[model samples]
Target: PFPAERIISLAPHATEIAYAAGLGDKLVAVSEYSDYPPQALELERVANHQTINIEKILTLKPDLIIAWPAGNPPRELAKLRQLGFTIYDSQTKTLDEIADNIEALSHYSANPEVGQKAAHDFRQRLQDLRTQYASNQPIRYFYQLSEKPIITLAQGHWPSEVFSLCGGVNIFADSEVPYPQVSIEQVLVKQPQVIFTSEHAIANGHMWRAWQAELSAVQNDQVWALNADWLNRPTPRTLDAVEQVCTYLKIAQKQ
Candidate 1:
């Protein structure tokens, strides 16, 4: 729990975790997509996380470099190991992990009190959402990650748990892959009641509207879009997304 003089976060979510831990001032650099809470706008960014600039990263003199094991490039991590730099992998398999990370980041950044309070507050918010929506009518739903191949949340993904926690039963919860390629026929056969989408997915050439006439979700006009970053990214702001989803789902009752 020694103070980390300087830090570099490997992903947008990790950056949010650090900021939530009250260690925003300690962050020396962050990945290209760490634009959240607005304060991250001014930080230096690594153009590409997959193909890292080892030299530039080294030049930054980061005492602690945060890594996303599942998302970041392996070679970059290998280089960090060879250089003997402190690189801790961050995970977001469940909502609890986010709270755990807040505390972890706070300790790493030498702000344990801030981290503890922030984590406690976040858990309280989580409980509030759960309590408010626990009795919500069960609504079978599909959360869209992309359109062409029908990628969506599965039971293994944190978003799937969040969707279920908010009283929406995710249709692809049992898929073998966390982000599986789902069949249109299967979705139609299952007959979901509500559908959630990301603005980026719909705007970036994911034409889910083509099947509006075929599915009950579309027939009822229950398909909705929210900010992609808030809904899709596992950040502290997911509570905002949860509130939004719950509100949308409550109105999208099975009809």
Candidate 2:
């Protein structure tokens, strides 16, 4: 088994997990956009935001490589498998699975004490959030993860579960798509009391301010911006996003 002395994290979220597990110094290289923990930005980039750089990765001679199966190209992963290097595939889809993901990485990284504590602390924070918000208020929400395509999440995705834990109702929970391409008309019909836009999505040309004339969420000042790190990545930082989401839901519910 590799001792994870020289690690390579192949996704932004995986990088966050590695740092939280006390493997920050161990990471020799990181994927593109793995900008968390500040130190990651200085590492060699061997993966694009959603793709792999097999050639450079091989040259690094890493003891462990953390991968995101869903985010990475499958054939590239297959090639890595054939090359006979250690791989850790991370695919966390639920709130609780965040701890599961961290704990599993801890076991592999061989820093059980720090990893286990981080995971436990993360779960404890989640429980505290649930206790503070569970069944206390109900606010209907539309979480716009992407614009242009205008995507939202359904039950199978982590964000939906986060919404559920925050005493918020997802407007598109019944949609079969985990990340469904939706229309403004559908959102208007559903009339969610609160609308959340990914801040990163905003940079990608989604400005909720434009919806003021057309959406109830825009009209009532219920539109909010969420941190991409907390809402998009499944790491210890997600609970920080959870805390922010719960606070917004509470305010919306009161209004």
Candidate 3:
């Protein structure tokens, strides 16, 4: 009920969000890979992608705990809930939600000015990107998750919105699966003009380069790599991914 004097973030993105909301000083502990803003790196790590250090978390005695539904283990969060700890579920499903998180976190941080300014700046940056990149004919692109099984994102994924915002069309936007597995032939059928993959999936990017005869992106050499942190995390830094996407689309059009 009171302002969070000591906060714990159970996911990397949540850590970055808390910092954006001006709660960096209050963050007592954070999850693995909370590398942004540089200061978070100095904090003690208590969680990773799938598990949390419950014993260590207990020792921290944080007043506010931010958890991610998909990233954090359900059992751990449930246990914390049962222990009467105030936990904020920072599951960001949309780009807009990222800004909302900043504002919501502000309420708990008891610093409305900092949070409001951060959120406002985030929204304004997004709008500026949209205005600069709007297109009558968007560049058609394929988002590659990996090369082995051939996974791609659907409309529900956050990156899909990033592609759309940068005036790019996702070839597999109609898939039922959030991350749909598609056959090579299916992608060939769509004939995407460009190909995108995060740096984390460098193998996928390399594999696409060999498909010059079959894929337009390969022949045109339009396969692009984006920063994994910027594209994968739903933080304000996601605007960095947006900027890259827009620049890539412009280059794609020119080519």
Residue range 3-95, candidate 1, lDDT tens digits: 888898888888888888878889888888889767887889863656666787888988888787767788888888799988877887777
Predictions: Cα RMSD each: 2.5, 2.5, 2.4
Point out the worst 10-residue segment of candidate 3 by lDDT. 200-209
Residue 82's C-alpha lDDT in candidate 3?
Answer: 94
* Ranking according to TM-score, highest score first: 2, 3, 1
lDDT of 3 by residue, 70-112 (tens): 6688898999999888898886677788899998898876676
User: Model 1 reaches what TM-score against the true structure?
Assistant: 0.88
Candidate 3, after superposition: displacement of residue 93 in Å? 2.3
Of candidate 1, the 10-residue stretch with the lowest lDDT total is 200-209
Off by over 4 Å in 3: 147-150, 181-186, 200-205
- Checking candidate 2 for backbone clashes, the offending pairs are none
Error of 3 at 49 (Å): 1.7
Badly placed stretches (over 4 Å) of model 1 are 47-49, 200-208
Q: TM-scores for all candidates?
A: 0.88, 0.89, 0.88
| Superposition error at 83 for model 2 (Å) | 2.4
